[PDB]
Amino acid sequence: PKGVSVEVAPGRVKVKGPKGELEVPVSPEMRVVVEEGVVRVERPSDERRHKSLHGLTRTLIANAVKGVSEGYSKELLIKGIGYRARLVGRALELTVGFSHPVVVEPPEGITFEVPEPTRVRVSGIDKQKVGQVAANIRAIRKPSAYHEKGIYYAGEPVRLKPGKAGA
Amino acid sequence: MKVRASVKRICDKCKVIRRHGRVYVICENPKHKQRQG
Amino acid sequence: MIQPQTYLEVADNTGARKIMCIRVLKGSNAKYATVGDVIVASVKEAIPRGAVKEGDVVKAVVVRTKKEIKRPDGSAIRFDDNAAVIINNQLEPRGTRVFGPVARELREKGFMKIVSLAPEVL
């Protein structure tokens, strides 16, 4: 872990890196601290809630690091028809079946990108805000249903017979 | 088939979980949705 | 001021001359009626030689109040009775010959075919 700048604080491990500055509020119940190339991760016993927080801790903090390690791959695509999506101004302007344009303004921890108005990408740093806000995009529009129209991060459509079924 | 005091699995997509309270039954086809009521 | 008994009249050619309002086909517990409401009146009397016959439930467009309806333009207008025409179960009146004037009350309801036939407007 080269370009890292480590720090271990109480219930929250502070880390800095090339992209952004962040921490992950883990737990002051097992002990971790700055060393070598990485950081030692140890639990003080073999409880089950322990090991839960073991894989948890390990991940959590690694997820903090994945952002600084240039993990700004926040992916979006929109399989449909009249699903224009523009990088106008700085932010989201898109129609996905609705008549009224959908506008979305970016919070801190992300930067914007729209290549061709049929697929969109955000470039930011927080696995929380990644999936929370991106599934909030999948909430901007419900997928497939019978055939295929709407927003899928990269998901898939399953067919449910349209030419009959409802009778 | 939501909500009933007994809850079971048919296929290997079907499973059981605890969250915010009682028992919950899932599957790939969410047509197999239940609860323990 | 009409209710499920208010004996009322017609000014048409078609057949009936008198009916009896049943409902108002609106807010179902309103019942009160001025120039605009919709009475599903039960037919009471008609002309012994023609179509449409005594005692068939019919829907109905309403005109002519006996207590003047409060006009927007300051004024107030009413006729010499309490009356109007039928609406049929596929919209519009089953009529074709008006007797005497109307009001722009009806015009504000947006039913012109009646108003083009209307000789005098108030």
């Binding site: - | - | 006009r71 927007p72 300051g74 004024s75």
Partner: protein, 205 residues
Amino acid sequence: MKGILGVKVGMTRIFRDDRAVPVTVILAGPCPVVQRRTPEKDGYTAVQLGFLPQNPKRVNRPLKGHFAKAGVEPVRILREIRDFNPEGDTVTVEIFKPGERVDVTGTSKGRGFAGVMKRWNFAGGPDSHGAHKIHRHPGSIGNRKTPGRVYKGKKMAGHYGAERVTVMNLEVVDVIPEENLLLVKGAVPGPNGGLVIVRETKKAA
């Protein structure tokens, strides 16, 4: 935020556009700013407004003549408006420009003894048929043995009349500076010289 004092004059159905509209004129009158109020030294958001001056002899006492700017005492007191704070000048009418809705608090005609049929709304009884004993009365009250109590807050017979109430949303039509008459929609209780004031309405969003 905004507001002004006022007395009810008129109600007529003037012809704006081509229309009969209920117009209450409100002589807001000379309402001088006096005791300003703030949370720290007092409690809440308020300023004091004196409806109209006519008391030299028949009033006496501190006079907000001491306040900082004299201005004497009105024919009837200055009042602390909920939500309002100006600059230092006399508010009257022109602060309200043509085309806005406002809240309006009235004190209104009392009545005294009031019955149910014109307090709530019940069914009196037979003007024939049954007993002529009851004629006009509410009928039953509570249940038998259980519960058995006449419920607390119940609708009963007593007083209805002079109440202090704020009405919601009425367009300001016009405004007169020279004598001081605000012209708005049609309502306002109280006598044709009773007590009523304007607040800033809580509109859409």
